[PDB]
Design a protein around this ligand. Structure first.
Ligand SMILES: [Cl-]
Ligand SMILES: [Cl-]
Ligand SMILES: [Cl-]
Length: 87
């Protein structure tokens, strides 16, 4: 559906090495996606796809997505950057 911009932040250690993105309900609902769906994320390198998982309560309403450093490096983005996401 429509793309949205979200601030990428580092995965909690619990989630390092899972090909996932933690996204909150407002973000998922704007994108039209569910947990388990793949989303495409754009950065300075070529885009990647990650699997949506429900945000942690600590992060709800903050406009962020969490993904691990391997994902950010593959995207050519840093923690704190805005990234474009699309379902
Ligand atoms: Cl998982
Ligand atoms: Cl959520
Ligand atoms: Cl590189």
């Amino acid at each position: 559906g429509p793309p949205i911009k979200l601030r990428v932040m580092e995965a909690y250690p619990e989630d390092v090495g899972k090909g996932i993105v933690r996204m909150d309900k407002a973000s998922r609902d704007k994108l039209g996606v569910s947990a388990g769906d793949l989303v495409e994320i754009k950065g300075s390198k070529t885009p990647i796809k990650l699997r949506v998982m429900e945000a942690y309560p600590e992060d709800v309403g903050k406009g962020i997505v969490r993904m691990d450093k391997a994902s950010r490096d593959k995207l050519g983005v840093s923690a704190g950057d805005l990234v474009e996401i699309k379902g």
